[PDB]
Amino acid sequence: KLTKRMRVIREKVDATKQYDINEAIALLKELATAKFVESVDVAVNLGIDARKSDQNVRGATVLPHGTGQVRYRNDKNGIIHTTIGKVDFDADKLKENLEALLVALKKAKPTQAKGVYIKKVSISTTMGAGVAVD
Template sequence: MAKLSKRMRTIREKVESTKAYEINEAVELLKELASAKFKESIDVSVNLGIDSRKSDQNVRGATVLPHGTGREVRVAVFTQGANAEAAKAAGADIVGMDDLAAQVKAGELNFDVVIASPDAMRVVGQLGQILGPRGLMPNPKVGTVTPDVATAVKNAKSGQVRYRNDKAGIIHTTIGKVDFEAAQIKENLESLLIALSKAKPASAKGQFIKKISLSTTMGAGLSVDIATVETK
């Protein structure tokens, strides 16, 4: 049997795997156990009461977290004319059309989020095989295809997270860093949960938010007592 690392021994000693933690207790414990040499993220997994095999029960969208994610995001915008100037003024890192498409085709993907105005989709549509597998393809459902590119850029820069359930009906995303205050993580989590509740498919019956788990980049996962957070 492989010898457990000091980190894993500490986690096993302090984490009760069968316990649903009060939200603030969960965050403080995660912060205590975060011992990596880099600033770890705090991630959340939310099990939804949906049948992901049914297309009308899949959940997808985006929301801006009140305290951001603690991550610096580079934004590329496909647009032109006045919209290009508006995107630059809003803080976009890269703005272009055919020239930006050429960069993407050459493998220069120096950005984390791609936004496009509707008129630019004729160009962006040709990049689906490159952007799609990387989760970068703009989509109106998450607000990244929009005539108001300036607002989309500001949202991306200020801590917007995109969410989409996986085949098991679980949402995975980041809600902050271990140096955030517990109250900030709680408010970010509640903001996400409220957004998810608003996105509940009409055909989904019964309890919608079934389980919440928090974890750090290199740490263990903790189950959160749903009763200790606002979900609506």
């Protein structure tokens, strides 16, 4: 299945560990080893029911460092995806992007949402491995 590069992408990052917000921003430099400039996509598994139309989260947040206001909306399962800019942006720069997104999701808390909201926040680059933040 996997090959020379794709194995090392999962060997560098410990899958069975949820890193801190100060750790995932700098570790993603090892994953991006492409010719071009990649971008970081954020996967947030919202604790909402996608089969209920009254709990849909829809909105847009302003990225302090651009890519650059982005738009987002969850799928028919519960996980919402949006980018927070390029990978060549500094680690502290992506720190500002990620925290502004997390507050934005909490600024659109559904009224009928019963349960813990996020329970897992994960980010990944274009050639990135599974990296979750606290």
